[PDB]
Design a protein around this nucleic acid. Structure first.
Length: 197
DNA sequence: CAGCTCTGTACGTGAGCGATGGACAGCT
DNA sequence: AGCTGTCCATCGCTCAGTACAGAGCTG
């Protein structure tokens, strides 16, 4: 057993803390914590989750880091972490529409506070909700990548990637997502360039 | 009719489980 | 040789959002 004696009942109670400082370039917004993230106490520990593998392959990290290194990310790589929903659940379909919209009001508050250069939505499902709830925009055909709206009252961009979770069959391997991480690396460097003029 | 929303369903990989068995050393 | 246990290789299996069709619903 992956959860070494510790019950699923006990994991559902545990929350995953945010890694948020000011002056960040990137803020990874997950859907909500998973059983292993609530257990481990770190962001994306799932041996199957592609976050860390994609982070290295994209060149956003010098070496292959893991969930334990997540707290070193702001000072070294300019990366922070949060989730659309604080509550722990086994999957993303466990969460109600009210729960998600509660989370979006909370998220835009954390985002207006910390003002990162790029608010990275690790998942499309979560930016669909956030777009409608926050910008009043329900585009019929939503795309990945840089979105046309900024976080209200900020200069924070909204960039979307398929969930790093290995649950979506549409992007089955991590190699199938490294592209959105490479573009994310390019967007950052463009801003960390346009600012230096 | 035509364009919605919403719900139900089905979809690829690879990591890690437990169960199974073969290799193999120790001892009589 | 005969018997026995451990260990490890390997197998089947499970499990970590997104896209879409089609049913109700509404102009």
């Amino acid at each position: 057993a992956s959860f070494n004696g510790v019950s699923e009942a006990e994991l559902l109670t545990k929350t995953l803390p945010d890694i948020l400082t000011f002056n960040l370039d990137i803020v990874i917004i997950g859907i909500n914590p998973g059983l292993m993230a609530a257990y481990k106490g770190h962001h994306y520990p799932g041996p199957g989750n592609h976050f860390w593998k994609c982070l290295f392959m994209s060149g956003l990290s010098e070496v292959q880091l893991n969930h334990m290194d997540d707290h070193t990310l702001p000072g070294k790589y300019g990366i922070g972490f949060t989730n659309m929903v604080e509550r722990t659940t086994p999957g993303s379909k466990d969460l109600s529409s009210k729960e998600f919209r509660e989370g979006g009001r909370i998220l835009v508050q954390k985002l207006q506070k910390y003002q990162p250069r790029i608010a990275v939505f690790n998942g499309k499902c979560i930016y669909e909700i956030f777009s409608k709830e926050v910008f009043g925009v329900k585009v019929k055909n939503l795309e990945f990548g840089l979105q046309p709206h900024k976080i209200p009252d900020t200069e924070t961009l909204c960039y979307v990637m398929p969930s790093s979770s290995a649950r979506c069959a549409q992007f089955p391997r991590a190699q199938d997502k490294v592209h959105y991480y490479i573009k994310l690396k390019d967007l950052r460097d463009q801003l960390k360039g346009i600012e230096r003029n």
